[PDB]
Design a protein around this ligand. Structure first.
Ligand code: BU8
Length: 154
């Protein structure tokens, strides 16, 4: 009972791009760029597509850095989120009716205004570590339990 999603982080040596979602699931929080994987499309092709649709950027090189499963108590579907980091990008981030992009210095990540799980696995992403995670949520603000382990292969 799971559904595939992608999440792409545009990470450069001194800064990371995040986008403030203006409506829908997760509105009001800074996040990477992603969404559901479609029929007939590979997970990586979906990550590339979602980055363009949501940020206006075109990614050359992409690589997998994590997989995180989210459970929301009372909701049947688990979110199976495949996390990617960019290595090269083209274009300028585009503000739209759906998303407001901003670059953040690496020591100024706005964790108070992000999903609470990001405080756990973003430090790994920043240090170029790969990870498998699982977070059980009650509502959208409370982590009931979690597991997070570094791995060599996502
Ligand atoms: N970055 C990020 N964290 C999340 N936690 C739960 C659901 C979606 C999420 N996107």
């Amino acid at each position: 009972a799971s559904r595939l999603y992608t999440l792409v982080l545009v990470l450069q040596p001194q800064r990371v791009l995040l986008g403030m979602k203006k409506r829908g699931f997760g509105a009001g929080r800074w996040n990477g760029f992603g969404g559901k994987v479609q029929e007939g499309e590979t997970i990586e092709d979906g990550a590339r597509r979602e980055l363009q649709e949501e940020s206006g950027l075109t990614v050359d090189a992409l690589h997998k850095v994590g997989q995180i499963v989210f459970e929301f108590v009372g909701e049947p579907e688990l979110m199976d989120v495949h996390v990617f980091c960019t290595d090269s990008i083209q274009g300028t981030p585009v503000e739209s009716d759906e998303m407001r992009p901003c670059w953040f210095q690496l020591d100024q990540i706005p964790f108070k205004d992000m999903w609470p799980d990001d405080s756990y696995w973003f430090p790994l992403l920043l240090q170029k570590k790969k990870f498998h995670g699982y977070f059980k949520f009650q509502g959208q603000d409370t982590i009931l339990d979690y597991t997070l382990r570094e791995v060599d292969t996502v």
